[PDB]
Amino acid sequence: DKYKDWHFISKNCHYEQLMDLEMKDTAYSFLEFVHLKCPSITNLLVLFGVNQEKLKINYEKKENSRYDNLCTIFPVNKMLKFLMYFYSDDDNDDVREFFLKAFICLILDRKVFNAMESDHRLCFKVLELFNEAHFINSYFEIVDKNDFFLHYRLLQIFPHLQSALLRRRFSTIQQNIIKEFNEFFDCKNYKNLLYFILTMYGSKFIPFGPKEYFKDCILDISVEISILKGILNLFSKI
Amino acid sequence: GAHYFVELTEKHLLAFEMLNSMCLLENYDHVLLFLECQFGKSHNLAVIPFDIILVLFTLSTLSEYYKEPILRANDPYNTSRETLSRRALKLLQKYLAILKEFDSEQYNLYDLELLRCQFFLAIDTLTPKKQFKNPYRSYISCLEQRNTILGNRLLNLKLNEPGEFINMILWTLSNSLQESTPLFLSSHEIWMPLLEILIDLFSCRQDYFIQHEAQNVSKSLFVQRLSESPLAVFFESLNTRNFANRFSEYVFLNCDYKLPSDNYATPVHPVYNGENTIVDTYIPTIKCSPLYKSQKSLALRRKLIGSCFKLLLRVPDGHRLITPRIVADDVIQGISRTLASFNDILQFKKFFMTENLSQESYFIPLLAEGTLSEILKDTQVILTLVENLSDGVSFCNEVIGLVKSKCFAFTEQCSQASYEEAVLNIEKCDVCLLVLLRYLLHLIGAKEQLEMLHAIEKNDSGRRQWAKALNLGNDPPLLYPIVSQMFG
C-alpha cells in the first residue's frame, strides 16, 4: 500500500476563486460581511474541491483506502480560517452537525494532515468550540474496527482526547481491551493490531513500564510483526 | 558553568542514556516515538537532553523535498505517515511552547528547569563568528563519535564556520518571496520554521541573562555587560560598522524598495548541498498565492526587527553599547526609510497588518510614525503620535492639523501622467495612519473624534473631484469609509 489514506478532497481547489476570496480579508481581519461568493458551507467546501456534492466514510465503498490523484490544496490555515466563518454559534443543530462533520472529515485526510503548520492554533481553536464528549460522541465516522489507524491520526493531531476516546470505543474497561486484543491476533489483522497498540498504550488502562500480557503473545506469534515487538520493548522500558 | 545548570536525577539519567544509545544505532524513529508517546499524558515531561536537541535541530533540516531516498531508507514502514523532519519540527515547537510557559500547575517545577537548562546548553554552542563541551559527566553522549546525521553535518558545526551564521539568515530572507519551486520550498519547510525557533530561544536566553546578572550596578558596567549578552553576540554576526544602513538592507533582502545601494548582498549559497534542488520523485501539493508568501515573509522580517529592538531599547540614556556599534535612535530612520521608499502596496500592508497587535508592540507604532514622518517630508512637521499613545484627546487633537494642512490630499504640482506615484504616496499614508489610530483605540479602550471624523470625510471631496479633474473612470483611494467603521 502507498498513500492509501482517507482523501476527503477529491478534486483540485478552485485557485483563482479562492485567491479572490483570499483578498478583502487581511484588512478585514486587521480592521462574514463578504459572503456573496459562496452562500453556504456546502459552497465553501466544493470551492476547496472538497467533494462532488457530498459526510461519512463509506467503508463498504472502500472510501477509507483511496489513491493519490495528485490534487492540489490551498494552505490549511486559510482553509480553516475560511471554514470558521460559517460557524453560526447561535443556530440550529442540523447545520452545526454538518459544520462539525465537515471539519472532522477535512482534518483526517492525508492532504490536510501532511500539509499542516508546525504550530497548531486553528486546529485546537476549532475543536475547543464543540464539546469533547460531543466531538467524540458524534465521532469521526469510521467503523470501530478501523477506528485505530485513523484514531492514531486523530491523537497525533489532538493528543489530549485519548482517555476520553477509548471509553466511547470500549464500554473495568480493561477486560474489553484485552478481549479486543484477541480477534485481532486470532485473525491476521496485525496492522490494525499495531495501531490499536499505538492508540491504547500510555492511557490509564495500559500504562508504560515493565509492569498487559501482550509481549508473551507476540513472542508466540513469531515483517510487520517485528515492529510490534520493538514498540512493545520500547514501551516496557519506560 | 554556575548559573542555569541543573543536575539530573537517577530517573532522568536512564532516559538520557537510553535516548543516546538509541541515537547511536541511527534509530531516530524510536528516538522520536519515545518523546511523542508521552506528551499528552500524566505530568512527567520526558525532557530531551541537549545532545538530542542538537540531533533534532539537524534532523529538522532533512526535509523530504530534496532528500526522499535517505528518509525512505531510514524507516521503510513509516507507521506515522510522516517524515523525520516534519516530526522533529513538531517536537521542537511543542517543547518550545512548553518552555515559554513556566507554570507550576504543569508537569513539574524541576523538569521544567531541567528543560530550560537543556535548551540553553544547546544555543550556547552556536556562536555568531564574524564573516565538545559536555557538562554531564555521567553518560557517553552520541556527539563524541558522530558528526553527521544522515548526510547533514550538524547545526552548531555548520553555523560555527567563518561567516556562516549570517549566510543562514541572508539566505532565507531572499527565498521567502521566491517564485521558484526549490528556493521558496527550502525557505518554507526548512529555514523559515527553524529561524523562528532560534530567534524564539535567543529572545528568552537574553531574558535569562538580563534577569540573572548583577543587580544594582553602575550604568558604565551595566552597559558594558549588555555587549556580552546572548543576543548581543547574535547581532555581532552582522559584522558592520554602519549598522543603520547595513541592518536595514539586510532585513528586507528581496522587497521592491528603492534599492539605493548597488553593492547588495553577494549571491547567497545554500547551507546544505542540494538544498536548492528539487528531487524528481517528490511532487508538491500546496498552491501558495503570492499574498501568502508575502505574509509569511513579512511576518519573519517583522519578527527579526522585533528581536532587534529587544536589546536596543534596553540601553539607558547613557552611552551606547560597544560590541554591536548600534545607535538605537537612527536605526529606526533607516528601516522607516526602506518602508516609505517602497514600490508595492500589497507588501506595505502585510508589514503593518499584523496578526498579533499586542505581541509586537513598542516598535510598530515607532515604525508607523517613522514612515508617516518621511513621506510627508519628501512629498508635501514635528509629529507626536507615538508620544500621544497615552491621551485620547491629544492624539485626536493633532490629527486635524495634518489633514487641514493638505497632508493626505493630492497636490497640483503633478499632472495625470504621474498619477499612480501620486496616488501610491497618499495610499501609503492611509496604511500608516490607520495603524496609528488602530493602536490608539486598542491601547485606550465625544466630539474630539467627531471633529476629526468630519475633517477626514470632507477631505475626500478633493480626491473625488481630483478623479474628475484627471478624467478617471473610477474614484481615488478614499480614507473615510475605512475609518468610520473603525470607530464603530
List chain B domain ranges: 1-159, 166-192+206-353, 355-487
- Are A71 and A170 contained in the same domain? no
Distance CA B300, CA B278 (A): 24
In one-letter notation, the amino acid at residue A30 is: F
Distance CA B319, CA B316 (A): 7
Distance CA B446, CA B456 (A): 16
- Are A73 and A12 contained in the same domain? yes
Q: Is residue A146 part of a domain?
A: no
- Are A44 and A105 contained in the same domain? yes
Q: Is residue A135 part of a domain?
A: no
Residues 98-127 of A with CB under 8 A from B: 110-111, 113-115, 118-119
Nearest alpha-carbon partner for B53 in B233, B236, B201, B232: B201
Distance CA B430, CA B81 (A): 48
Residue of B292, B346, B485 for testing the chain A interface, max A β-carbons within 10 Å: B292
Q: What Cα–Cα distance (Å) separates residue A218 from each residue in A186, B257, B405?
A: 12, 65, 85
- Are A106 and A214 contained in the same domain? no
Minimum distance, in Å, between the CA of residue B157 and any CA atom of chain A: 25
Burial of B415 (0-12, 13-18, 19+ CB in 10 A): exposed
Q: What Cα–Cα distance (Å) separates residue B101 from each residue in A157, B149, B204, B211?
A: 21, 31, 11, 17
Nearest-CB residue to B287 (from A13, A27, A230):
A13
Task: For chain B, give percent helix, strand, coil, nearest 5.
Answer: 50, 0, 45
Asked whether the beta carbons of residue A237 and residue B18 sit closer than 8 angstroms, the reply is: yes
Sign of CA pseudo-dihedral B10, B14, A231, A215: negative
Q: Is residue A11 part of a domain?
A: yes
- Are A207 and A103 contained in the same domain? no
- Are A123 and A185 contained in the same domain? no
What is the separation, in whole angstroms, between the first and last Cα of chain A?
32
- Give the number of A-B residue pairs with CB atoms closer than 8 Å: 89
Among left, alpha and beta (phi > 0; psi -120 to 50; other), residue B218 is beta
Chain A residues in contact with B30 (beta carbon < 8 A): 230, 234
Q: Under a CB-based contact definition with an 8 Å cutoff, are residues B111 and B40 in contact?
A: no
For chain A, the domain total comes to 2
| Domain span at A190 | 157-238
Nearest CA in chain A to B437: A31
Q: Is residue A139 part of a domain?
A: no
Burial of B229 (0-12, 13-18, 19+ CB in 10 A): buried
- Are A30 and A121 contained in the same domain? yes
Q: Is residue A175 part of a domain?
A: yes
Residues B385/B391/B395/B398 CA torsion (nearest 10 deg):
-120
Q: What is the DSSP letter of B149?
A: B
- Are A169 and A92 contained in the same domain? no
- Are A106 and A175 contained in the same domain? no
Distance CA A180, CA A185 (A): 9
Q: What Cα–Cα distance (Å) separates residue B250 from each residue in B137, B259, B265, B334, B449?
A: 42, 12, 8, 11, 40
Alpha helices in B212-242 (DSSP H): 219-225, 230-235
Which positions in chain B have a beta carbon within 8 angstroms of at least one beta carbon in chain A?
18, 30, 33-34, 37-41, 77, 79-82, 86, 89-90, 92-93, 97, 193, 283, 285-289, 291-292, 295, 349-350, 353-355, 357, 434, 438, 482, 485-486
Nearest CA in chain A to B485: A31
**Crossing angle of the two packed helices A214-221 and A224-236, in degrees rounded to 10:** 150
Asked whether the beta carbons of residue A31 and residue B286 sit closer than 8 angstroms, the reply is: no
- Are A98 and A211 contained in the same domain? no
Q: Is residue A197 part of a domain?
A: yes
- Are A164 and A91 contained in the same domain? no
Q: Under a CB-based contact definition with an 8 Å cutoff, are residues B8 and B138 in contact?
A: yes
Sign of CA pseudo-dihedral A80, A81, A85, A87: positive
Residues 4-43 of A with CB under 8 A from B: 5, 13, 15, 19, 22-23, 26-27, 29-31
